[PDB]
Amino acid sequence: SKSLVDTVYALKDEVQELRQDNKKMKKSLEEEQRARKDLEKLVRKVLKNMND
Amino acid sequence: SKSLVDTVYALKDEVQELRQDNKKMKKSLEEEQRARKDLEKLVRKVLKNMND
Amino acid sequence: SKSLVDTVYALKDEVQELRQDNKKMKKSLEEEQRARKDLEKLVRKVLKNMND
């Protein structure tokens, strides 16, 4: 059925673009962890400049 | 087909609520970046209070 | 229809594994907030060691 088949492939589309966004979300969540882990280093270097 | 058509629209539902969650996830990931970028400022102000 | 029915359940699969990933993404986004909120504490303790 034309319309029945349409909506499904319309959905395969929508779902594909969703995988896409996870991909990059997973990606920049992971950049954020790294950005802040580096911040702890800096902060820890500070603390071991006071009580040294 | 009743059940065949049901599951598809059942899926259109499920997929719509997924776009929704990306939306807000994208959203609070973005709030987190900002929250921590502000933290670097603070930390950097600290470092340029020691070696000034 | 065999193939028509296949792609739909093929899609129910794909969509289920997507909910899964949100679940854990929501999860580690939330771990990240906590990890950095703790960092502010540390940083704030620093600032209230200088101007005390």
Curated annotation (Swiss-Prot), chains A, B, C:
Signal peptide segment: none
Processing and modification events after translation: Phosphorylated by PTK2/FAK1; this promotes interaction with RAC1.
Domain of life the protein comes from: Eukaryota
Cellular compartments annotated: Cell junction, Focal adhesion; Cell projection, Ruffle; Cytoplasm, Cell cortex; Cell projection, Lamellipodium
Function: Acts as a RAC1 guanine nucleotide exchange factor (GEF) and can induce membrane ruffling. Functions in cell migration, attachment and cell spreading. Promotes targeting of RAC1 to focal adhesions. May function as a positive regulator of apoptosis. Downstream of NMDA receptors and CaMKK-CaMK1 signaling cascade, promotes the formation of spines and synapses in hippocampal neurons.
Subunit description: Interacts with SCRIB; interaction is direct and may play a role in regulation of apoptosis. Interacts with PAK kinases through the SH3 domain. Interacts with GIT1 and probably TGFB1I1. Interacts with ITCH and PARVB. Interacts with FRMPD4 (via N-terminus). Interacts with CaMK1. Interacts with PTK2/FAK1 and RAC1. Interacts with BIN2. Interacts with YWHAZ. Interacts (via PH domain) with NOX1 (via FAD-binding FR-type domain).
Protein name: Rho guanine nucleotide exchange factor 7
Source organism: Rattus norvegicus (Rat)
Species lineage: Eukaryota, Metazoa, Chordata, Craniata, Vertebrata
Originating gene: Arhgef7
